[PDB]
Write a protein that binds this DNA or RNA. Sequence first.
DNA 1: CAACAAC
Length: 223
Amino acid sequence: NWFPIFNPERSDKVPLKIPLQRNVIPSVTRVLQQTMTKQQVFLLERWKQRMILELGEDGFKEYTSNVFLQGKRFHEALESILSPQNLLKSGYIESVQHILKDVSGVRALESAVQHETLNYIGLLDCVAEYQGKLCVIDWKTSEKPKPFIQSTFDNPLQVVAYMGAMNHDTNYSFQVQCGLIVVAYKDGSPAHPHFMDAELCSQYWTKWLLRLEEYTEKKKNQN
DNA sequence: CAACAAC
């Protein structure tokens, strides 16, 4: 019951600088967000200026908050739909009805992955079968249509980062060789599923590894 | 905390 502040088994009579693991092992989000191309940074900055001019500085902050909240709500609704036992009325949930009918055999939900040797961590949405094929599934709300996998920006990199980590994480006894990005729409129009077979996942894996090396090179130029 | 999105 008792927790001592001192440790009488020790004595009390270059300095140690022990790294904090959570600070030196990045999340997938952090790696991707800190290594965007100058062109993507430009497009996002030009869009943000247009939004601030249209909405005002506080209006844009509120827009940004609402985009995040809508996404979090969608994922909360999905977590309860995908688990064994007002949130479920949204247009996004309507958007993915035809996808959900092909999803089965859920094996992980909002579950931590850590790559033992590439030193990154993440939290995946979902591992489940889509039309019988076991997938890391990345569910995404989106304001604009994303009818091609190339319309999804870094989403395929997030998918393969989770696959590679999960496949080399001793907390998991199975491997996953396919990915799926599901883009859902607020007006209820049919969601776009972008399936990634093993070949396509291996192609994006190369690109993810480059982003991870860019992040690593960026952090040692900061030290 | 990560992921939650924006192009």
